[PDB]
Symmetry: C3
Subunit: 357 residues, 3 copies
């Protein structure tokens, strides 16, 4: 029988939206990857840089093995809000695949805009979900052309841009490789044609550098969390100490195994009336994973454990928890099991938890 | 276990395409709504107004409660065919959400056009399904700007239209909220950019009125019933007395419960050769519901009852009925059960019923 | 219970990428066709014409019965590669539906272009799958206007082209009938507006002929095999004798039954290191069938038999085979059964088989 075994745990901090999240999962069904096996490890870290100007330093490392090819991507960036709609970033990183690698540095800004703002909606809807909007990226990137492969790609690109009028359109076929293209529509997401503002070869300290300045916008009909939850997804103001997440998966023709461990702020939020809630589930991950969650029938063997800070209690949970031991609450079987099956297949049915002192 | 229990009943009138439809359904699986609970009641009524000019008066009321917010929409309209391709309407209604509400009045015409008409298809295909075409809307609407929220929205819009060249394009991200966007492609449906022909503030008897005149077209590759079955979906010529439908659902994290009761013309149609059929199932509802029907495994406990007028008998049914008692025919289990599972998940496999005297 | 019973067999030739493929399948679940019943037979044949210029002659016959309407399409074409990116074709055929039929002749070229070519990818990825690109069609077609239906359609079209500026856009709604439209996005595929280069009525030996010259391009994000595997899908260089495939299905409200039998080159390919593999599974068929494979729950009763040439053995298989008798290997149950369920529902998880002497 195909069985998914999972275990999730959330330990909340008092007052502080911080939480520790742990997850383990294993399913004996094949992944929908046309190249197997595929293993990946991810490590994310962020630390307060300069709280006066709202800067944080984020670092990410992705490492994987796909059909015997070793890949790696690292990125380090400094990010800050300038206004409520405009955020800026500056960073550098590296990509490496087998014997090949290249570096890059960049600076960019993103402006997030909602299509409407209405007090009539605001005062009448206590927990608004869909927020339609558009987000603008303005990027400057630099890559040292220090090997023949880079030179070839740079020259090929400069040739294409200057010869093909549809380049700004067709580039999207290249960018959203494989089923990434398909996922755009699934999430109510649109990518505009790009605008190329400048392409130059500079003379760097150590050699020629390919410099490019370009922009694009991305629209969302309300499920794109990047747009609808712009402020909430970057809780820089609550980052009083370093946060981190380590996650990884191993997969082949027999099954998938995953592990996650992290601690960061933003896990709980003020729900008003003196109540707090675990944050609303982001929609994108459920909709995108929904594209791969329907290929094998499975049974669910799942459990969730929520540990509240001392003296806090759950005022409302639906689905309902099965047991409680002081501050620890557990869910398993029954309606919780049906909800897990549901979300693993792509459903976004609400699972709400409100707690208070 | 997840079980869907449903009961459907159709009682046909003799000769007259009229029928009474009753449906009850309950499933213990969560709905895919990111806000729960969600309850809704709908009431539709239509009555012959002036049969000489083909006018009917339709009225609709929608009432719901979503996460504790009460919403309501009413609409009343007079509709008539002018030609076989052009239909006109004039009406008014109201929207209300919590402490907020606004009214509106409108007049509009819709022109439905098929991309081709061929006698070679017509004489060779007895029961044609896909009909590709395009439909044009021309709308004039008026809303009294009688509160600050309306004024804010009106001024914001007039500002956007005059400052953003992409407004006619991006408005579509706002219009098709959440997963409504996604459903467009799923049904082979396209919405053009809008055309804004006029935006004015008039001086009404009781205050300023925001007046707008705009158009859009919508294409369909053949599954869009609004286009392919343009004439059949508005049987004004068979409406010799008032028709109505009452329907509603209650839903939360535990399950969904639905009830429908109606009586209206258009349930049966001439199939030629002296035969009649229950109308072909519209495709849109199956394809759209198919987007939410695949998140939980279920067992089917379903029954269908068809009551023919006295002296009529079923000449062909596939799937086959299980039993017959005079004019009453029943379906349950076996192939019918597999067909129900199929359509609830998004399939459009044909279920045909032909009857005759 | 819904059960799918299938049997697949591959017999490989030694050295030669030739293989014989046999498949039988039956499932008692209804097809997603809004018109039933639907039966179809297909016959394909190809033979070396002139190996010096790389020409092959291909012939196809499609015959079906849909809801009692008999349809038939035949096509015969001569095809050759001119370069590695450009292929040319010349042919003729016929379409017939009930009492109607028409012929056609044509000549066209297709140019396939990849968006990038990189040695860094080539040397580091041993078995590349996604290849983004665009394909250009240039078509000249001729149809004798020998009946009133043809004349009507021709005149209607010439009228539309000259009156509607959006014809080159809207024609796509007509072309991708029903759910064919939807399938485009699902496979990461895009069709451009068409370009009409010429529309003329010529005076043929036997009467007026409608002549048209038009083009279109089609983009693919990497799953479109027509683009990413352009060379491999037309193994003209391995066609040393005639190849053929016969296939057909019967279907109605009770189930689907299918049979396939063929022999052709391209079934196995050099995998490097002295190893050979069965070719990578094309992605389109799995993704498109995935749109209809999820409407009924089923159990799998499936078996695969692979017969290698004398003296060859399997060096790697995942999922693993169950048994081996000399050169014959069999798969059934366990991980193979889960893989079948997976691909029948739309998954593309890799099933790899490497063999060698
Ligand atoms: C049988 C039903 C099964 C099931 C079947 C499958 C199948 C089948 C698959 C998965 C896959 C996965 N499943 Mg599942 N899965 C089940 C239940 C679970 C459970 C659980 C029970 O709790 C968990 C935790 C998981 C977890 C996972 C992940 C390990 C994995 C998806 C990886 C991912 O996020 O990539 C997200 C990837 C991306 C975002 C990459 C995008 C790249 C493109 C080009 C886009 C660029 C983005 C943008 C430009 C970059 C942003 C720029 C800004 C700077 C940010 N599944 C159920 C029970 N699962 C998939 C997988 O990969 O397995 C190895 C997969 O194929
Ligand atoms: C450039 C990227 C953006 C950004 C984009 C997003 C987006 C987009 C989302 C979040 C979400 C969240 N972010 Mg943010 N976020 C950024 C910086 C931060 C910082 C910080 C101070 O720098 C913090 C503390 C957080 C914290 C948070 C939480 C409030 C929330 C996740 C809650 C949860 O329970 O997850 C539980 C944690 C897990 C289940 C494990 C996740 C572990 C894996 C390793 C990470 C995901 C990998 C992703 C699928 C693959 C990346 C592919 C790209 C090609 C690289 N973000 C930067 C500025 N963030 C999510 C949310 O809910 O928003 C409201 C969300 O949708
Ligand atoms: C959507 C968003 C959102 C939302 C944001 C950006 C921002 C950025 N985007 Mg965008 C799509 C694109 C593409 C593309 C070609 O598809 C590009 C090139 C960019 C480029 C960029 C940069 C200009 C900028 C900084 C990214 C960064 O630092 O990555 C760092 C890379 C990572 C951290 C890798 C993983 C990120 C994932 C999505 C985070 C998941 C959070 C997880 C659930 C919880 C995290 C807890 C941790 C302890 C932090 N985006 N894009 C951000 C910005 O600063 O604007 C100026 C921003 O806020
Ligand atoms: C486990 C599998 C389950 C299942 C799982 C689900 C799930 C999961 C969900 C449903 C949902 C629903 N299911 Mg189901 N369901 C099952 C079987 C059934 C059976 C049955 C057995 O007979 C029935 C009768 C139902 C009935 C229903 C409905 C009560 C409900 C869809 C509401 C709707 O139509 O909104 C249609 C809504 C719209 C058309 C709104 C569109 C708004 C957008 C912005 C578009 C504008 C349109 C346009 C501009 C206006 C027109 C202008 C012209 C003037 C006309 N289901 C199977 C057995 N069902 C959904 C729901 O809402 O539940 C509460 C849902 O999430
Ligand atoms: C402005 C809207 C259009 C219109 C648009 C449509 C569309 C679109 C369709 C129909 C369909 C039908 N219409 Mg019509 N229809 C109109 C006016 C009428 C009038 C009349 C004289 O005024 C009559 C008698 C009918 C009668 C009929 C039937 C012939 C047929 C439904 C058969 C059935 O078995 O349903 C069985 C009944 C049910 C299963 C219960 C339905 C109950 C719920 C309350 C109604 C649906 C709500 C919808 C999902 C949500 C609306 C969301 C919008 C945002 C408001 N229509 C007006 C002019 N009609 C359908 C059909 O089959 O076409 C051939 C269809 O697809
Ligand atoms: C598709 C169609 C179709 C099809 C039609 C329209 C028509 C109209 N459309 Mg359109 C999309 C849009 C949008 C939008 C912004 O998305 C707008 C603003 C409009 C606007 C309008 C009006 C100009 C006009 C009258 C609507 C009306 O009276 O509603 C009244 C609202 C309701 C009745 C609510 C529920 C309607 C549902 C879809 C009916 C389901 C029928 C049910 C299955 C069986 C009914 C039996 C009853 C006893 C009647 N459409 N659109 C119609 C017209 O008159 O053209 C001039 C028309 O025929
Ligand atoms: C319950 C789950 C079931 C299941 C449920 C279904 C359902 C439901 C359906 C099918 C359908 C089919 N299934 Mg299945 N199926 C199952 C398992 C199987 C197994 C097996 C176990 O091995 C097999 C062999 C099959 C085989 C098949 C086929 C007989 C059939 C798809 C026909 C096709 O290819 O049309 C491909 C068709 C096209 C490509 C036509 C495209 C026309 C459009 C307009 C596009 C034009 C293309 C282009 C312009 C022309 C090219 C130009 C160049 C010159 C080339 N299924 C699983 C177990 N199957 C479907 C069917 O048709 O059944 C009769 C269907 O509805
Ligand atoms: C105009 C069409 C193109 C073409 C387009 C494609 C496409 C597209 C694909 C192939 C694929 C393959 N082609 Mg090629 N192919 C052409 C000419 C040929 C010639 C030849 C010398 O003329 C040969 C020998 C082949 C041989 C091959 C194999 C290498 C490979 C199938 C392997 C397999 O196991 O299938 C197993 C066989 C079966 C499972 C049975 C199939 C039987 C049915 C009758 C055929 C499919 C019908 C299709 C679904 C419906 C057609 C609808 C259209 C509207 C007409 N092609 C011409 C030039 N070929 C596939 C592949 O894997 O590419 C790498 C693939 O995706
Ligand atoms: C994608 C491709 C690909 C890929 C190719 C074409 C080629 C052609 N395309 Mg295109 C889409 C379109 C549409 C459209 C309106 O949608 C049109 C009109 C065309 C028109 C054409 C012609 C100019 C040309 C020759 C087709 C032919 O001979 O058919 C013959 C028809 C058939 C053989 C019917 C079935 C074809 C299926 C897809 C083959 C499946 C193979 C099966 C899996 C294994 C086969 C083994 C056998 C023993 C052969 N394409 N298109 C080809 C060409 O020659 O370019 C110059 C080419 O290589």
């Amino acid at each position: 029988v195909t069985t998914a075994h999972s275990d999730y745990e959330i330990v909340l901090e008092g007052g502080s939206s911080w939480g520790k999240v742990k997850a383990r999962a294993k399913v004996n069904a094949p992944p929908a990857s046309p190249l197997l096996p595929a293993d990946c490890d991810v490590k994310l870290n962020v630390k307060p840089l300069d709280p006066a100007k709202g800067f944080v330093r984020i670092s990410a490392v992705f490492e994987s093995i796909v059909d015997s090819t070793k890949n790696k991507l690292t990125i380090e960036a400094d990010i800050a809000n300038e206004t409520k709609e405009r955020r800026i970033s500056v960073g550098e990183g590296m990509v490496s695949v087998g014997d090949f690698s290249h570096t890059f540095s960049f600076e960019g800004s993103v402006v997030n805009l909602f299509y409407y703002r209405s007090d009539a909606v605001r005062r009448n809807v206590p927990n608004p979900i869909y927020m339609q909007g558009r987000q603008f990226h303005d990027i400057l990137m630099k890559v040292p052309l220090d090997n023949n492969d880079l030179i070839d790609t740079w020259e090929g690109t400069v040739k294409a841009i200057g010869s093909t009028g549809a380049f700004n359109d067709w580039i999207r076929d290249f960018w959203f490789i494989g089923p990434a293209f398909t996922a755009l529509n699934e999430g109510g997401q649109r990518i505009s044609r790009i605008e190329v503002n400048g392409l130059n070869t500079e003379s760097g300290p150590k050699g020629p550098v390919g410099v490019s300045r370009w922009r694009f916008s991305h629209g969302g009909s309300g499920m794109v969390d990047s747009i609808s939850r712009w402020a909430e997804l970057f809780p820089s103001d609550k980052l009083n100490r370093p946060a981190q997440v380590e996650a990884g998966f191993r997969s082949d023709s027999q099954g998938i195994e995953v592990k996650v461990d992290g601690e960061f702020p933003g896990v709980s939020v003020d729900a008003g009336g003196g109540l707090r809630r675990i944050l609303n589930h982001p929609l994108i991950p459920l909709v995108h994973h929904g594209m791969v969650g329907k290929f094998n029938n499975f049974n669910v063997d799942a459990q969730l454990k929520v540990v509240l800070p001392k003296g806090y209690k759950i005022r409302y949970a639906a689905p309902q928890y099965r047991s409680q031991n002081l501050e620890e609450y557990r869910w398993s079987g029954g309606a919780y099991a049906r909800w897990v099956e549901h979300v693993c297949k792509g459903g976004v049915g609400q699972f709400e938890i409100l707690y208070a002192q």
